[PDB]
Structure 1
Amino acid sequence: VLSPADKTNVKAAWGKVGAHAGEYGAEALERMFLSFPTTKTYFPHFDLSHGSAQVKGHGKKVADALTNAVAHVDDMPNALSALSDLHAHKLRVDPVNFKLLSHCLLVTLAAHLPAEFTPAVHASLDKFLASVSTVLTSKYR
């Protein structure tokens, strides 16, 4: 789990993203598809091109699913139940992919918020994503 200081360091880092959630979430998604092309096989119904309003439209829902996860962090299994029903139960996503997106999500935030990306916040954000990943990769019916 996460330290109380981690719960704060995510809230104040993600609370510096702004309405830039989709832009960042789109960058994260684009960085993943480009760097690790196997993650593309999860989206055959997707236009995986540059600028794609589908990918830029996913990164919104994705970066907004991550927002309610930052809200009620100490209630992650209950709050992400529909997302877990999708990822764990329906999609059956390999957790390595979750590590790939989590990494790209950190490269994005480091590219865009260099001041909010302190060695301590990197750690907190990585712990947070690891936890979101755990809740989304597990079947807790």
Structure 2
Amino acid sequence: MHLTPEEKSAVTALWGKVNVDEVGGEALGRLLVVYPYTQRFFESFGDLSTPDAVMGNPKVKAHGKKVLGAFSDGLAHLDNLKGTFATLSELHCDKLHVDPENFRLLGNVLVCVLAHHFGKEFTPPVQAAYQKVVAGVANALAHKYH
């Protein structure tokens, strides 16, 4: 995870303006609407049959809040993503059985969600730093797969 101080500053600064609860909700929802096969993991969440059903589902919203919560905490340990997410990695592999490729998909949607919210301020330079951060998190989450 080679981020430059200018990049790290760019990532940390924008992140201060994010409302994680809501952004968390948009990103998990969109992921389930744009890549409907990712619903294989949430049969217990109830109705995910139409976009409104997904986006407004309370369970989808609470899980997105929880997913982004761990993400943010990662943003404060950008020099030790691997250690920060080790236990999470283990969980997603041995108990939940999640194909890591799904972390890459969420990363990319997150980037569309950030672009949608901040418009102009998500400049190309700022998107490049965020691509490196989403890739680094996805790799940290796959590190303990075996």
Same fold? TM cut 0.5 = yes
Matching residue within 64, 67, 71 for 1:66: 71
Cα displacement (A) at 1:52: 1.2
Greater relative contact order, per chain length (Cα 8 Å cut-off, separation 6+) = 1
Q: Is the 8 A contact 1:93 1:137 kept in 2?
A: no
Moved over 6 A (4+): none
Partner of 1:27: 26
Counterpart of 2:137, as a letter, is: V
Matches within 5 A, 1:108-119: 108-119=113-124
Instruction: State the secondary structure of the residue aligned to 1:114.
Output: helix
Cα displacement (A) at 1:140: 7.1
Deviations 1:42-85 (A, max 9, x none): 22222333311111101111111111100111111221122112
Q: Is the 8 A contact 1:106 1:126 kept in 2?
A: yes
Structure 2: tracts of 5 or more residues without a match: none
TM-score, normalised relative to structure 1? 0.89
Deviations 1:105-126 (A, max 9, x none): 0111111111331101111111
Question: Is 2:3 the counterpart of 1:3?
Answer: yes
State percent identity of aligned pairs.
42
Q: Whole-Å Cα distance in 1 between the matches of residues 33 and 8 of structure 2?
A: 31
Structure 1: tracts of 5 or more residues without a match: none
State the Cα RMSD in Å.
Answer: 1.7
* Paired residues, number: 139
TM-score, normalised relative to structure 2? 0.86
Matches within 5 A, 1:130-141: 130-139=135-144
Q: Is the 8 A contact 2:107 2:135 kept in 1?
A: yes
Q: Is the 8 A contact 2:86 2:144 kept in 1?
A: no
